[PDB]
Structures are given as structure tokens and as C-alpha cells.
Ligand SMILES: O=C(O)Cc1cccc2ccccc12
């Protein structure tokens with residue numbers, strides 16, 4: 001679920017504040033997305049967006065309000081290590097891995113201040 005993804009980021013990148021840092025970054029980090037990502041970080045977000053897309057299109061999963069963000073899994077954090085609980089059902093595991101892969105990705109992408117709150121009507 002959304003809150004848990006926020007905590008994943010705090011786990012992968014300890015000195016970080018997610019809502020502020022990664023929301024409305026580039027073209028994909030934020031609600032929806034458009035165009036080509038600008039950045040490796042932005043790419044991390046596009047892949048996340050696509051991961052949620054695929055999850056919605058697993059005909060065996062029916063998320064509340066049709067939003068995968070709505071779905072909790074369990075997962076733990078041990079010194080930069082995110083671990084998805086094996087006991088999460090197939091749909092929760094999938095979402096879990098979207099979030100975790102995205103937090104691992106964010107932790108290795110260059111953060112470019114330029115791109116925070118990008119003019120998306122122009123550059124995306
Ligand atoms: O996925 C989204 O729609 C927005 C979104 C994207 C990336 C990181 C985030 C961190 C905290 C809250 C929202 C976030």
C-alpha cells in the first residue's frame with residue numbers, strides 16, 4: 001500500500017523524505033505520467049507505474065477501488081535491506097516487488113534537483 005512504499009524508500013534511502021523528494025519529480029514520479037522519462041530516477045518511476053499496470057492486468061487480482069496502492073502486504077526492513085514476506089499472496093507479493101524494486105532503483109538513481117516539479121506540459 002502507498003504508506004508502506006513511503007517506508008520502503010525511507011528504508012533504502014535512510015536520509016530521505018519521500019512525499020517531498022519523489023513526488024512530482026520528472027515526468028513519471030507522481031500521479032499518472034507522460035512522455036519519455038528525463039532521468040534514471042524518473043525511469044525508476046515509469047517502471048513502477050508500469051508494474052502497477054501489469055498488476056491491475058493480472059486477472060486473478062481485484063484491488064479495492066481498482067488501485068493496487070490500496071493493497072497491503074507485509075515486508076521488513078533491516079539496514080537498507082527490503083525483504084518482501086514470502087507469505088504475501090500472489091497479488092500482494094507482486095505489488096510488494098513493484099514497491100521494493102522501485103525503492104532499490106530510487107536508491108541507485110542520480111537525484112537531479114533540476115527535475116523536481118518539472119514543467120510537464122513542456123518537457124514530458
Ligand atoms: O506513485 C505515485 O503516484 C506518487 C509517488 C511516486 C514516487 C514516490 C512517492 C513517494 C511518496 C508518495 C508518492 C510517491
Ligand SMILES: [Ca+2]
Pocket residue numbers: 028029030031032033045049
Ligand atoms: Ca506515476
Ligand SMILES: [Ca+2]
Pocket residue numbers: 071072073092
Ligand atoms: Ca492486503
